[PDB]
């Protein structure tokens, strides 16, 4: 109804719902994720058999 966002937990163990809250202020969320490094690739091969 424009009041609450609706999302699905595709791995829900049984059946249930949870209500959360997040304010306009990103800090005001209860729970937060705070990355400083992500998805950085590593590439080479091992000379013992030269497999990648």
């Amino acid at each position: 109804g424009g009041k609450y966002r609706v999302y699905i937990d595709q791995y829900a163990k049984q059946d249930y719902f949870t209500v959360g809250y997040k304010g306009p202020n990103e800090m005001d969320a209860g729970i937060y994720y705070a990355p400083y490094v992500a998805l950085t690739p590593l590439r080479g091969s091992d000379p013992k058999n030269f497999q990648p």
Partner: protein, 131 residues
């Protein structure tokens, strides 16, 4: 101001040449933005091989989406493995920067391959015999 921004009087030949050869030219667009009205400034030509054109459809109908597919048509630009004809050095890092369509000045040729939207060079015709 624009042709001066591009230093046309000294570089128009270089910009055109790169474009002809590569068939795509892009420049980073400058804005203040606190006083955005005064923000246009000399722009930064971006390198081919560091830039990609990306569009997405966000809308849906039955048995396929047939409504306002606005596409957005934005760009991705990065540095990363800057080493080929020049032996470069860098450490490992993620990149993939998304740039709004409005944020970049760009032109390209009308030359496209058999499928997709892969834009080819004016020299494409010459690759076979040149080699």
């Amino acid at each position: 101001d624009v042709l001066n921004h591009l230093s046309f009087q000294r570089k128009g030949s270089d910009h055109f040449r790169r474009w002809y050869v590569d068939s795509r030219i892009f420049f980073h667009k400058i804005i203040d933005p606190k006083r955005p009205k005064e923000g246009i400034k000399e722009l930064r030509r971006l390198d081919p091989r560091q830039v990609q054109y990306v569009r997405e459809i966000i809308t849906e109908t039955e048995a396929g989406t047939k409504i306002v597919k606005g596409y957005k048509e934005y760009f991705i630009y990065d540095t990363a493995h800057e080493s080929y004809a020049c032996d470069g050095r860098m450490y490992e890092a993620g990149t993939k920067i998304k740039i709004p369509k409005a944020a970049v000045v760009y032109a390209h040729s009308g030359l496209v391959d058999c499928c997709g939207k892969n834009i080819i060079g004016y020299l494409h015709r010459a690759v076979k015999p040149a080699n």
